[PDB]
């Protein structure tokens, strides 16, 4: 029996799939300002609303990132737990209005100290007494000079960031965490972020960042003032030798300002909107922000000797020298790696699921499993050969091939109680990457005749 | 609360047994995404228990298995066979006996069975993509639906007697849909 | 039992490998400018320099 | 109960809510945008101030 | 759709490039000896070369 | 890759070599008599020719 004249089925095959963006960053400060474990921002203006004291950290690492050529849309900020700030003369040398940046309850003000010829001393003693006099921090904030450094503290439920003006010294944060057992929060809460800095300097936050970056796939990106990454050849025991030992895929670089400027953004900003389909290196990209390299010829090559990327001027601007991982890959590799394997994957999933979604699904016979050639030729593979990142082409001469190869069993060469259980396992794919060009030698000659 | 078993039925009601369309994948409005840890996944799985899991945001049924270990497309698919063969048959046997003209036990008339088999049932099975048809030309291997049926010289003579035709078989091959894929990628920088 | 509709593996066959040189000589002099054993120079300026 | 109604009889269903858990964290799990979102209906919803 | 996208063209060859061209900030032009071209060129993809997603 | 390693032809052949043979301190031309050539030669390997590391 029927109960319709005229019946109509209509199926949607137009379902929409999460994806994977390979774009924004992640920074992980120390500091109090939010509750929440993560927060995106589109621009400085917005951080300062937030209350980031400028030329904080944070804010360092926000301006050299958007300053880049290719900088990110958008940027992300971690946070740990912040104790006290500790400001650090040590070493350092003054002689005009040293200034010190500081933010309390969304409320902005500068500390001047006038140094005259002053020791670190008498600096630090003179801005400890500058900032215990102001009658807007009395009761809010502490300060305490000590030897050459003085230690800022914020009575809660107050709120206090400090930043850097003119002067020469450092900032230094302590925490009652540690980067290790924070990240696992931080990635449970957003997963929308693929490169991974860390404010934490020493040692082991950076090698427990690399492991779980490599981990999760995600890429780790650090720098160092370390003296050590340009000792002789044999000195093995930089933050750059150990990452090497352990064949961990991180991006390193050696810069005098790292521990004061946070670098780090200034070499994401230049690869961040650049898509990895078009597998374009870093070698020669400027990077605002940074200072050049000064050393003598044994030091570059001592530097080169541990993967630990070197900026170097040339013909009177500055450009980036290479980029190689701790395990000696270049990065654009590993990204291109990723970008195609996350999306080959949803690729083959989404099509799947929306034929499924209409009847129809797909089924197990010689007639219909070619199919996913087509599907993986579309999308990645052409994408990436239509913008030069996948080589094509036949040479006539030495008679090879360069075209991406796809290889798929037919059903009668398939085990059957692989098709009781439905599952297809020996699909083939090869690539050709194409490598960017990184050194020319050229040979000349003048002659006189020709026989 | 909810008895969502209407749920499951409402994603191949109307799917007709014909086309051998299996549950895998088909969204289920009106059912709650299955939250628990990877261990529990497995275990429910080793029961034959159904789950339905979310991924890539939206969710998804993971599959469909009886508490036999078979898949549930493949008991549709049987039945929706057994009925429309039987029915089909028997239909002819009586179209023609209402004309006189009944069906007779010869050489010359057995093999009309053999259309009525390819129509109905075998042909709208392999139209729609739920029966495997072809010939592999490298494997050598035949797909396609066979039938036999044996000559009056071949009856015993007591079947004759009693007018009972036993010997008729048939074989198909049911045409699996796909539930999982694997696959292996690499990057080089030449070829030999 | 599998956990995942699609699995993609992807390995790189694209490792640089180390290798010698035939062009950089050396000079073993006498002097105690330097405390390492070794100093690379591009040219003679670079001496002169320490 | 509204949205369910609209699916099982042909209709588009359109709410607005203040709910401030519209935009809370990623993991907050907890509106009726969520909640909606589970049961994978069809129903057109927004956050504004003035819904109420 | 093929018979829509193309419509980009024309409003990106106006206003900004065009006035650029006629205020002489963007050069133009083709040369017979050289064989070399200097007009602006615009680049957009059919619908069959976008990814499905 | 062997559609773009041709490029710095063009750029060699500019500047420094074209400069050169228009001001006349490169020779130029073909001799049809002896058959010996002065032509400027630039030779570039390609991709299959070079080694894999």
Same mark, same amino acid.
């Given at each position: 029996?029927?109960?319709?004249?005229?019946?109509?089925?209509?199926?949607?095959?137009?379902?929409?799939?999460?994806?994977?963006?390979?774009?924004?960053?992640?920074?992980?400060?120390?500091?109090?300002?939010?509750?929440?474990?993560?927060?995106?921002?589109?621009?400085?203006?917005?951080?300062?609303?937030?209350?980031?004291?400028?030329?904080?950290?944070?804010?360092?690492?926000?301006?050299?990132?958007?300053?880049?050529?290719?900088?990110?849309?958008?940027?992300?900020?971690?946070?740990?737990?912040?104790?006290?700030?500790?400001?650090?003369?040590?070493?350092?040398?003054?002689?005009?209005?040293?200034?010190?940046?500081?933010?309390?309850?969304?409320? $902005?003000?500068?500390?001047?100290?006038?140094?005259?010829?002053?020791?670190?001393?008498?600096?630090?003693?003179?801005?400890?007494?500058?900032?215990?006099?102001?009658?807007?921090?009395?009761?809010?904030?502490?300060?305490?000079?000590?030897?050459?450094?003085?230690?800022?503290?914020?009575?809660?439920?107050?709120?206090?960031?400090?930043?850097?003006?003119?002067?020469?010294?450092?900032?230094?944060?302590?925490?009652?965490?540690?980067?290790?057992?924070?990240?696992?929060?931080?990635?449970?809460?957003?997963?929308?972020?693929?490169?991974?800095?860390?404010?934490?300097?020493?040692?082991?936050?950076?090698?427990?960042?690399?492991?779980?970056?490599?981990?999760?796939?995600?890429?780790?990106?650090?720098?160092?003032?370390?003296?050590?990454?340009?000792?002789?050849?044999?000195?093995?025991?930089?933050?750059?030798?150990?990452?090497?030992?352990?064949?961990?895929?991180?991006?390193?670089?050696?810069?005098?300002?790292?521990?004061?400027?946070?670098?780090?953004?200034?070499?994401?900003?230049?690869?961040?909107?650049?898509?990895?389909?078009?597998?374009?290196?870093?070698?020669?990209?400027?990077?605002?922000?940074?200072?050049?390299?000064?050393?003598?010829?044994?030091?570059?090559?001592?530097?080169?000797?541990?993967?630990?990327?070197?900026?170097?001027?040339?013909?009177?601007?500055?450009?980036?020298?290479?980029?190689?991982?701790?395990?000696?890959?270049?990065?654009?590799?590993?990204?291109?790696?990723?970008? $195609?394997?996350?999306?080959?994957?949803?690729?083959?999933?989404?099509?799947?699921?929306?034929?499924?979604?209409?009847?129809?699904?797909?089924?197990?016979?010689?007639?219909?499993?070619?199919?996913?050639?087509?599907?993986?030729?579309?999308?990645?593979?052409?994408?990436?050969?239509?913008?030069?990142?996948?080589?094509?082409?036949?040479?006539?001469?030495?008679?090879?091939?360069?075209?991406?190869?796809?290889?798929?069993?037919?059903?009668?060469?398939?085990?059957?109680?692989?098709?009781?259980?439905?599952?297809?396992?020996?699909?083939?794919?090869?690539?050709?990457?194409?490598?960017?060009?990184?050194?020319?030698?050229?040979?000349?000659?003048?002659?006189?005749?020709?026989?």
């Amino acid at each position: 029996y029927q109960d319709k004249v005229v019946d109509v089925e209509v199926s949607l095959g137009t379902q929409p799939i999460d994806t994977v963006g390979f774009e924004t960053p992640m920074f992980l400060a120390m500091h109090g300002n939010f509750p929440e474990r993560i927060r995106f921002y589109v621009s400085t203006a917005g951080m300062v609303a937030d209350g980031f004291a400028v030329g904080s950290p944070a804010y360092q690492f926000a301006t050299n990132a958007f300053a880049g050529n290719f900088a990110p849309q958008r940027v992300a900020i971690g946070r740990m737990s912040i104790d006290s700030s500790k400001v650090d003369f040590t070493g350092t040398t003054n002689t005009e209005q040293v200034v010190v940046n500081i933010t309390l309850n969304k409320v $902005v003000k500068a500390v001047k100290i006038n140094v005259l010829g002053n020791t670190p001393a008498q600096i630090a003693t003179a801005l400890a007494d500058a900032v215990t006099a102001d009658a807007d921090l009395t009761g809010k904030a502490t300060a305490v000079a000590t030897g050459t450094y003085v230690t800022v503290t914020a009575v809660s439920p107050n709120v206090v960031s400090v930043g850097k003006g003119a002067g020469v010294y450092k900032i230094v944060n302590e925490s009652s965490e540690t980067v290790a057992t924070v990240l696992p929060s931080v990635i449970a809460e957003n997963h929308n972020w693929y490169f991974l800095a860390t404010e934490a300097r020493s040692d082991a936050d950076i090698v427990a960042a690399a492991e779980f970056a490599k981990a999760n796939y995600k890429l780790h990106i650090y720098n160092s003032t370390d003296v050590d990454a340009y000792a002789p050849e044999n000195s093995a025991a930089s933050v750059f030798d150990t990452l090497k030992s352990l064949s961990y895929d991180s991006l390193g670089t050696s810069d005098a300002g790292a521990d004061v400027d946070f670098t780090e953004g200034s070499v994401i900003g230049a690869m961040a909107a650049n898509d990895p389909s078009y597998g374009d290196s870093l070698h020669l990209k400027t990077m605002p922000g940074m200072v050049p390299f000064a050393g003598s010829d044994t030091q570059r090559s001592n530097a080169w000797s541990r993967n630990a990327n070197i900026y170097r001027g040339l013909y009177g601007g500055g450009s980036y020298i290479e980029g190689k991982t701790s395990s000696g890959q270049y990065v654009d590799v590993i990204r291109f790696s990723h970008w $195609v394997k996350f999306r080959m994957e949803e690729s083959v999933f989404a099509y799947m699921k929306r034929r499924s979604d209409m009847g129809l699904s797909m089924k197990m016979s010689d007639e219909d499993l070619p199919v996913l050639k087509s599907v993986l030729m579309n999308n990645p593979i052409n994408i990436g050969i239509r913008n030069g990142g996948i080589l094509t082409g036949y040479d006539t001469e030495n008679k090879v091939s360069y075209d991406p190869t796809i290889i798929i069993p037919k059903r009668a060469n398939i085990p059957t109680n692989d098709l009781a259980a439905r599952i297809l396992r020996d699909v083939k794919v090869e690539l050709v990457y194409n490598n960017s060009l990184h050194y020319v030698k050229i040979r000349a000659s003048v002659v006189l005749d020709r026989p």
